[PDB]
Ligand binder design. Sequence first.
Ligand SMILES: *C(=O)CCCCCCCCCCCCCCC
Ligand SMILES: *C(=O)CCCCCCCCCCCCCCC
Lengths: 166, 167
Amino acid sequence: EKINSELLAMTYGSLVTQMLKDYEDVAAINTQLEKMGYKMGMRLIDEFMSKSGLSSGACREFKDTAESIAKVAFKMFLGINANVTNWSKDQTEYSIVFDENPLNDFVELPEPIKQKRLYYSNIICGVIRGALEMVLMRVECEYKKCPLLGDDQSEIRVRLKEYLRE
Amino acid sequence: IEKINSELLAMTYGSLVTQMLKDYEDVAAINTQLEKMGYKMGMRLIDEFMSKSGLSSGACREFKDTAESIAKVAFKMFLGINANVTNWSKDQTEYSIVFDENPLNDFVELPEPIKQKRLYYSNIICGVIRGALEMVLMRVECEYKKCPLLGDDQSEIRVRLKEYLRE
Ligand SMILES: *C(=O)CCCCCCCCCCCCCCC
Ligand SMILES: *C(=O)CCCCCCCCCCCCCCC
């Protein structure tokens, strides 16, 4: 709902504001926002699985995670419609692109923060990594494009590092 | 609202409190900054609440009216919490909002020295109340008095009217 989405956006906005006071190094902020999401995603995967109706085999292959994240997870948690593009030939990498992001609403980065490329929503990358670890996939996930930095759309890259064994 | 969105909000807020708790020696300042974050949010949120709640401007004429509006409508709409009003003052300028469950508190355990320092983990709620009511021209003071994370039997938030404001 819009009001709960506004409330989440403002809460996360308070977090990023706090990080900008507590850290002088934007790279450090990016790293900690991602580590914060990582812990969340390990806990969020259970809510996603139950409320999505997906089975374990919907998560057997790395290739399958693109549609689940872009078409289900993004709508469920952020109300965003995302698309999958830029597949690698070996299908170990894909990009998730989207033109809207409720966390970005009413946000304006000061010029030095833009030039140093803060990824305001970097927490999303951590959530993906932590969630996918729980279905036994170790991935790297990083932002490449964000309209707050003057880019034409948002793009997040997801790369498979290894399949895990329990 | 829905569990997955409420869990997601609880975890995002939890990362905020966790980041602030690095400043472990001035817990009072943490309480205050959490309130100021809520204060700014509540000024921005009040208009949306009025719209989704269907309340008119005259629904907010008297301070006594805010108690049911916050405890019974806002708390359900924003946190999924059912709350109750108690401990009215004789002149109806003070009431408390009491509740036994709080989704922001889920799976949270404060270390013993933080409990002794009386962190109010959910203090952002007090600021939301203060900022929202300012927009309907009430200057209020709103503080936590009891929280189960500190060993209390329930949550209690005190709301006190300081003055009716002028446009
Ligand atoms: C099998 O393929 C499992 C799918 C993994 C679900 C991933 C959920 C992540 C969605 C992004 C949520 C970002 C929330 C940010 C909060 C501030
Ligand atoms: C007229 O007097 C109407 C009363 C104003 C209602 C204000 C709504 C308060 C919202 C409380 C919930 C705080 C949410 C905390 C988010 C982390």
